[PDB]
């Protein structure tokens, strides 16, 4: 841009007035013209003097902003051309410019300080401008008493901090420490002086926040300098006092408390030994308790305090926690309990008040998390009782609890519409429920009778309320919420999640049952467990029953209430949420308190051995009871997808481990569930597709349990035989084409295919060769079905889905011959699909959607085919068949695009020799796909292609064409620098050195001023010097490409 | 025939349903509940399989919705009679009742018909309406 | 004197910004991905118990190549929405960068963080892992552009903060 003419400044200011005008009044041609004016101005060569003139003359803040941006981009673009004196003169010009204009617009000031920080960091990359000069200027700026100049220095430090986030680490060890010490000193001087002015309080705010950002820097290095900076007690006491002074600001309080939490999170090797951790932790707990006990927590401090406490408990190891004075530890845990219950009640109030900013729920969550980390003879028992009772009180309805109490009793407001995406309470509050469960374990002697009493009372109340609802509408939902939270707490109290291993009976529960096993008559206990229909209070001596089994019997009694409501037409009055709770609970019970293996415990109590043992009739009763539960839910709960899927999952839990499947298959309800499902009766056909798939998986899974040959043939001929008979009879109904469209046939074929997906999903190591031989015939018939349902998209997609299921689940266990048969079937299916969809053109009604789904499933099929005669030739036939279906618009579906490029790039990297052996159109389509992936689309796709070029360098015309593209990727301007880009660049450079020297010389000839030609010449010469026509040959070529990019990346 | 009832919860996200009287392909199907313990209600929205207009409805689960019986057939084009497609089934029958579709597809039919190519036409019969929707050429 | 605010929509490319706005506007969800070039300003009207409010949401470009003026669009912005993909962790790692740029050009304007695509099964960024809501002017929401999930939440919160009435609620016209 010209320096002087009025047209330059006029263009910039007019463009600014256009871009800042209300967007609905400016045409897009004018907008794009203005932003082209600014963008082209910022790309000009050496606009430094021009931008100086603009900053000194223009009065339009937008133009000043864009000028600072121009300096910022040009100083990095032309860094190698500028002298150190001119660069430093520019930096000082920006600093003094913003310094002499205190009323300058904020974003202009911050943009200029960003230019300064960029100049400084860029000077750190080339070791040109050290940080100590800007640090000395900042120190002199702070030494003056002017609050505006102090604010300016704090702004410069914040800019340096943000810009530096080898260079980053060298900044971390040295310069960040000096910044932290400046900020700490400022905070000391501000904490000493009393009564700050209106501006001094703002400088205090900005420097406190600066300390907050300094401490929150990612990975502070563990050096003795940072040791002397952080481990000094005057810093801890400094931030404690500072928080105590500005406590009522509600804004500086958060910065100070976040500083203190960050100081509490120290854990790395910065601690030289284990004793310094004890001293640091002890002093920190001292200052924290002294601060808390003489302070009202208020609202803005809750999350900060809780975060400090949970930081101390979670970060420092337990041996260091127990090495502090015992009185200090006791005061710390007492404070933890007090704040836990207070924050609990406050959060329970925040729920019913429906406030927009939830503060006490976060803090209470942090405190319960720290409880779980801390607890995991009996020391915390009193505290565990207090926190447990506070949780039960905060989650129980109006009469016995404060869940819906607002000191008034308004019971919240209207019911909030809950989406299906909303997580269930047992997931969202999983950490809190686990913590409260553990606290309930160490204090089981009090907690378990409490849960049993509450569950029995709520059970009777629900029975009476449901009987009354046949002859207080909110009272029923409050009761449902009570039973809800009680079931959750009990579940997390009696067992664990683990999710990877076999869950055992928690040791506290087994110990409580062993210690009291002499005070309990196991006969009355089995009467309480065996009779979940009648009240526990009316039984011969219910008081002498095992408390654990009485609690499990309480939730079981809830399950009986629900089931009896199902027996009547009261299913509409029940809560599907409570159904999910009971099903989840029984699922957890089945994994822990069913068929207990005595080899997994040192000692098992007699009540828990006789009722839940291996060969006991108690387990045979519980397993059939859960079966009846699954039959009830699957009979009425079709409309509630969550409850249905959780129910069928409970079924799978009853059939997975053989120890349970051997006992579940002897039940009549299992076989009549098999017949009822295979009959497609009215009640079970209302279930969704995944529920029926899972049900099929459970039945097939049950078919491999202990059976004699008679009931084996009966079982297989009662489960899999109706599928073969109905399917084969339908495809033999004297119909080859005409009758398939009718719903009586299409719905049956759909049901058969879904069932096949279930069978494939039931595959295990001992299922293959049996399930596979059963599915192969169905596949060979699915070929003809593919030929018959050409124009039926959903059925084609479903068939492909069964092929994807079988190929995914079974090919890892198959041999070679079976995998060859599966390969032939898949290749034939893709042949039919390609034959029917080759030159087909459709109108609308989401045809692109349907072909997108089909192609996605096909891509997954080819991938699972590449999981395991050359194993990969059939995949080449597949991509050859479906490649013409890959339109440019179908690649705009990012999932399909990613899958396709992952597949073809995997084929190009591994087994690259088969690529030249492909036909002409296949090779051209692949090469064009690679070029399109490199030149456009996603960065992941571009990196995948660049990764596919290196194992493809070892026909040659496309590889020579790639050299120009990779040269434009790096030497010219996607703009992502990558190691794979450097490796592909190296291999393509050493391959065809003639086109390489042609392109390098062509670029070196088209230059303007020889000053750029000289450094470009030295750069390319240093590139050819390291190349000198793999490992050692490219390892240095990568570092020389890094130096090249760091010396030529600006020259753009 | 014409339509068969199906519980709303069982509707496939990939399937079809009758909305406000028109047969539609379901394009979005989301479930919600009024209370925490409230029963599920489904929000359906689908595209008219013929006109292409967007029809949506919100009805509770467990309630029965009408699902249209969809048929799609392939005839080979053997004539164009004043604007009525003369279509040949693989059974030998010829149907001259279906008109020519408007838009670029009818233009493709006339162009590829005057050029003499063997053109396969896929006609979509839903409830009471029938229309040619696809073209396949070799 | 119509009540209107400037909202800047920022985030990594492909997080579902244009999807969020367009579904908020027409009601159709586009599965195809067409990258935004520069910015596209869309007016959005919400009828509240205190009258209508207009958010001129500036749908900005995620990819740096299509950035246009990028932070230049943030000037005189009154509120912001930062979006990331909960299924793509890198889009979450970049959230503090967007926050930095907004806080540089603007200052203490209220910003809402939105984790999009919560309808996808494999979720990499957990909800409890967020510390961005710990501020008087910052807030986080779980949204799904497909299922129209928590769509009105950022606009209702931002309206409550910009007007200053926590009792403000959205009503039907
Ligand atoms: N599953 C799912 N996909 C979504 C959601 N929102 C958007 N998408 C998809 O994500 C992809 C990207 O969506 P876009 O809105 O175009 O992305 P963007 O915010 O405009 O990104 P840029 O224009 O590059 O800045 C598209 O394929 C959308 O269909 C969602 O909530 N769930
Ligand atoms: Mg966009």
Numbering used by the authors:
A (entry chain B): 4 to 168, 185 to 240, 261 to 415, 422 to 516, 528 to 924, 949 to 1034, 1046 to 1064, 1067 to 1122, ...
B (entry chain F): 15 to 152
C (entry chain C): 7 to 179
Wording from the paper:
In this paper, we report the first crucial step and present the x-ray structure of the RanGTP·Xpo4·eIF5A complex. Xpo4 has the shape of a toroid and is structurally closely related to CRM1, suggesting that Xpo4 might have evolved from CRM1. Xpo4, as all members of the importin β family, is an α-helical protein built of consecutive HEAT repeats. Eukaryotic and archaeal eIF5A comprises two domains, namely an N-terminal SH3-like domain and a C-terminal oligonucleotide-binding-fold domain. eIF5A contains a unique amino acid, namely an N-ɛ-(4-amino-2-hydroxybutyl)-modified lysine 50 (in human numbering) that is called hypusine.
The final model was refined against a native data set to 3.2 Å resolution, an Rwork of 21.5% and an Rfree of 26.8%. The asymmetric unit comprises two ternary complexes of very similar structure (r.m.s.d. of ∼1 Å). The superhelical arrangement of Xpo4 is interrupted by three anticlockwise kinks (between HEATs 3 and 4, HEATs 9 and 10, and HEATs 13 and 14) that bend the superhelical structure into a toroid-like shape, whereby HEAT 20 touches the loop between HEATs 2 and 3. Xpo4 wraps with four distinct Ran-interaction sites around Ran and thereby buries a large surface area of ∼1,920 Å2. Xpo4 contacts switches I and II of Ran, hence directly sensing its nucleotide-bound state. In the case of the Xpo4 export complex, we found just a very small Ran-eIF5A interface, comprising no more than a single salt bridge between R29Ran and E42eIF5A. Instead, eIF5A sits on an unprecedented binding site provided by HEATs 8–16, and in particular by the intra-repeat loops of HEATs 9, 11, 12 and 14–16. The interaction buries positively charged regions of eIF5A and the hypusine-containing loop in particular; it thereby also precludes off-target interactions of eIF5A within the nucleus. The hypusine side chain bends in an L-shape and hooks into a crooked pocket that is formed by the acidic loop of Xpo4 and HEAT 10.
